[PDB]
Design a protein around this ligand. Structure first.
Ligand SMILES: NC(=O)C1=CN([C@@H]2O[C@H](COP(=O)(O)OP(=O)(O)OC[C@H]3O[C@@H](n4cnc5c(N)ncnc54)[C@H](OP(=O)(O)O)[C@@H]3O)[C@@H](O)[C@H]2O)C=CC1
Ligand SMILES: COc1ccc(Cc2cnc(N)nc2N)cc1OC
Ligand SMILES: [Co+2]
Length: 159
């Protein structure tokens, strides 16, 4: 099982300037619950977006995708292709825009947090992957984050 997990604005923006323009504690808690114990795969820019004090994310096999043969990610595995990262019962791709697009053909689950923020797309933004008609989705109710933004969880699945 390969799953993708991300949070997006209604516009599809997931990232800007190498970081994320919101932070919902409830989304972070859901992310930790879904990924804990499993392999997490991320692009090198997403690894860079994590503060060194929080890396590697605990209780998970941290895998970083990079084309740089000598890139060092302390506490993580650095691989040159996505297929090297797929040797576990459960693998979660945790970002960013490039790696979501690369991993989508392998994926059968997407856990999506929709953030009710009006954030028009801009040049340079990272975007959520486009899900075609093979995906079926189950939506949750709109909820209030303590950060002030509404959010809801989508669970997409396909065979
Ligand atoms: N809202 C959310 O839930 C999340 C948002 N984000 C945001 O996403 C943005 C980053 O996404 P993005 O800029 O798309 O970069 P990524 O995080 O997807 O990393 C891209 C890098 O991954 C490596 N890579 C990409 N494709 C391949 C390949 N086919 N083979 C080998 N290595 C490859 C390269 O590393 P190298 O250059 O070293 O070769 C490339 O520069 C940031 O703003 C981040 O905050 C991230 C996670 C979650
Ligand atoms: C602030 O530190 C982090 C930034 C991004 C992530 C990855 C992520 C978060 N939420 C959701 N739904 N999906 C994701 N792939 C994690 C982080 O700290 C653990
Ligand atoms: Co689990």
């Amino acid at each position: 099982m390969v799953g993708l997990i991300w949070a997006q604005a209604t516009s599809g923006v997931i990232g800007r300037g190498g970081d994320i323009p919101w932070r919902l504690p409830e989304d972070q808690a859901h992310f930790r619950e879904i990924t804990m114990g499993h392999t997490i795969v991320m692009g090198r820019r997403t690894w860079d977006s994590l503060p060194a004090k929080v890396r590697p994310l605990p209780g998970r096999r941290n895998v970083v995708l990079s084309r740089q043969a000598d890139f060092m990610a302390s506490g993580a595995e650095v691989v040159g292709s996505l297929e090297e990262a797929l040797t576990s019962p459960e693998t979660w791709v945790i970002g960013g825009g490039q790696v979501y697009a690369l991993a989508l053909p392998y994926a059968t689950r997407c856990e999506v947090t929709e953030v009710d923020i009006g954030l028009p797309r801009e040049a340079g933004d990272a975007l959520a992957p486009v899900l075609d008609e093979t995906w079926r989705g189950e939506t949750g109710e709109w909820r209030f984050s303590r950060s002030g933004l509404r959010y809801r969880l989508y669970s997409y699945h396909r065979s």
